[PDB]
Amino acid sequence: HHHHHSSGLVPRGSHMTNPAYFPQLSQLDVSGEMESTYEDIRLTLRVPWVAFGCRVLATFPGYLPLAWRRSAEALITRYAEQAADELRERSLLNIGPLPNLKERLYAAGFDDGEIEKVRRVLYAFNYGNPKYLLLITALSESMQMRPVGGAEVSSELRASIPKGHPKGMDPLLPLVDATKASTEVQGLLKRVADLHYHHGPASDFQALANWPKVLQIVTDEVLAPVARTEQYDAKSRELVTRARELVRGLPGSAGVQRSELMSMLTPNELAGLTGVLFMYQRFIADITISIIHITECLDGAEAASKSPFPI
Amino acid sequence: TNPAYFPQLSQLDVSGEMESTYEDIRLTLRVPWVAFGCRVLATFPGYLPLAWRRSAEALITRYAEQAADELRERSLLNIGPLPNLKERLYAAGFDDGEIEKVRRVLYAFNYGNPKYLLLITALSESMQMRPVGGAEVSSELRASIPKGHPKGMDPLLPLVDATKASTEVQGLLKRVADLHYHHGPASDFQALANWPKVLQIVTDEVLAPVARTEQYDAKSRELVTRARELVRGLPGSAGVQRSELMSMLTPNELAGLTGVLFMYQRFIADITISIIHITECLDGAEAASKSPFPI
């Protein structure tokens, strides 16, 4: 079975030649227990998307439904929320002074109502991005036979937060499919991915690609002078490391150890899975920073770094 | 299933075209081991033989040799005054002959490690559909180097196999892997595992206050980033673009392979620094940074 059903107007397989496409199971394409998992990830994390990293993990037989089932309880703790809160706050780059991005979007105009639509998207991602960095870290760390959780934590941080989505947030954010997209947009997504030296475009960039000119401006004018700079790389290393410590201190258990997946996955798959998790620690960290940076250029440091959706 | 072991295809088990690939890698790079990175890359159907074929001629050029030379020199950490590892090994019951055996292994690795970084970086970048090679290169630097192993160098190093090892060896290899936050131990450490005491001294006394420090991490990003730039300047072709692999590998193997290559870029930069650092404590900055097998 193939999931990509392009028409007779292109050859079968064409989408894989698309540099802005990366192999993944999409939110639309997913069915069965995987579809249930996807929905559960979104309600449990209070986010309107399934992370690119999860969608790639979804392509490994059996893994993600099990991996999520073992991490879900831990990721609804006040601890996990506070942990994502800290990582979100640490994401700020000490750069100054910043492009006034709002006046810039006016100049591209863009009125207040349209900039609010960009902002809504930026905020949903600011909220979930650090949360996903913890999940992927709990998963990567246990995949590599290092301890995840089991820590001694007060009742208050063990308490859980409610499942569902907060008032200011639509349940499911529309992402541009790079395979149904124009040359211009494929170009835009591939350029921002290459800018970060990434394997593909983050869901973040799929979502802003709804306004191709917004994505262009934030890529070439906002992110180009900052991405992959010393200070940027240093900040990413700090998030990767901090998230690593945060998952050690988790109450309960998260992730699934590589020894326990011997019955489930082939050696090759376990090697690819290990490499995929490694990569997504850094990818999410990078993206966590880039989008908070854009947000800061728009609204400032407090709006950027505080939880957009308190919870 | 024990944590010191990671999925790979060993130099011993390899057979068919894959065995021929391994031997040619050893002959072409002039190194006594096929990298852990490569041994794991060999678990994906058809990839490594193909990937090597299309990179071997880029990787035997004088440009590539001089590129590896640079990356090796860039590897020194400026950390301050060092443990005298020669006098520490004497203190631990080693004589001159045994330190010479350890030296020979350190120098072999110092030599090969940055070459493997260039190879895996080329594989990584081309897998991520970003340009590799095709630069303007002087006739002098497109000139290949002689194939085969130099003198002062074993044609194949003994590497301890973690799956068969004592609790002691299994523990030491995990500890050093965890120190660097690695998914499994380097061959470097499998080779030093032949002298368990050496592996422990180097892990606990030398690398323990150095690995994963801010300085180390910055040096590791330096090499990853430099290797990248050097690979762009390669003569002729290298690697295999993701586009050329779709009729061979599944979507999941492509994603797994992307992620595996991205990880080994950082792994080999790390180990290059760590082992070169160990070597500096033995013999000084000059013996550690410079090519042990100049050609």
Helix H, strand E, coil C: the string for B105-167 is HHHHHHHHHHHHHHHHHHHHHHHCCCCCCCCCCCCCCCCECCCCCCCCCCCCCCCCCHHHCCH
Q: What's the CA gap between B134 and B236, in Å, rounded?
A: 5
Q: Which member of A23, A190, A271 has the closest CB to residue B7?
A: A271
Contact B259 A279 (CB under 8 A): yes
Which residues of chain B neighbour A275 with C-beta distances below 8 Å? 256-264
Contact B262 A278 (CB under 8 A): yes
Alpha carbon B233 to its chain's center: 21
Instruction: Answer whether A13 touches B (CB < 8 Å).
Output: yes
Contact B183 A233 (CB under 8 A): no
Instruction: Answer whether B48 touches A (CB < 8 Å).
Output: no
> Which residue type, as a one-letter code, is found at position A169?
M
**Resolution of this deposited model, Å:** 2.3
B37 and B115 in contact (C-beta within 8 Å)?
no
Q: How was this structure determined?
A: X-ray
- Domain spans in chain A, listed from the N-terminal domain onward: 1-311
The length of chain B in residues reads 295
Kindly report each contact of residues B19-24 with a partner whose C-beta sits within 8 Å and lies 24 or more positions away, as own/partner. Answer: B20/B49, B21/B48, B21/B49, B21/B52, B24/B52, B24/B56
> Which residue type, as a one-letter code, is found at position A215?
L
Q: How many CB pairs under 8 A join A and B?
A: 109
Retrieve residue B117's tokens.
Answer: 């970084």
Chain B residue with Cα closest to A201: B128
Instruction: Answer whether A160 touches B (CB < 8 Å).
Output: no
Which residue, A192, A200, A197, is CA-closest to A219?
A: A192
Q: Which member of B129, B251, B256 has the closest CB to residue A276?
A: B256
Q: What's the CA gap between A208 and A213, in Å, rounded?
A: 9
Cβ neighbors of B49 (< 8 A, separation 6 or more) are B17, B18, B20, B21
Which residue do the tokens 């991405």 mark?
A: A227
CA distance B42 to chain A (A): 9
Contact A272 B253 (CB under 8 A): yes
Cβ neighbors of A83 (< 8 A, separation 6 or more) are A130, A134, A243, A246, A249, A250
**A251-283: b or e for each residue (b if 16 or more CB lie within 10 Å)?**
bbbbbbbbeebeeebeebbbbbbbbbbbbbbbb
Instruction: Answer whether B251 touches A (CB < 8 Å).
Output: yes
Which residue, B268, B279, B273, is CA-closest to B36?
A: B268
Q: What's the CA gap between A302 and A92, in Å, rounded?
A: 10
B253 and A268 in contact (C-beta within 8 Å)?
yes
| Helices and strands counted in chain B (H then E) | 12, 0
Cβ neighbors of B249 (< 8 A, separation 6 or more) are B44, B45, B46, B47, B257
Q: Give the end-to-end CA distance of chain B in Å, rounded to a whole number.
A: 42
Alpha carbon B95 to its chain's center: 28
Chain A residue with Cα closest to B262: A279
Which residue, B237, B228, B14, B255, is CA-closest to B121?
A: B228
| Helices and strands counted in chain A (H then E) | 13, 0
Which residues of chain B neighbour A198 with C-beta distances below 8 Å? 128
Which residues of chain B neighbour A18 with C-beta distances below 8 Å? none
Q: Secondary structure of B49-85 in the HEC alphabet?
A: HHHHHCCCCCCCEHHHHHHHHHHHHCCCCCCCCCCCH
Rounded to 5 degrees, φ, ψ at B87 are -70, -25
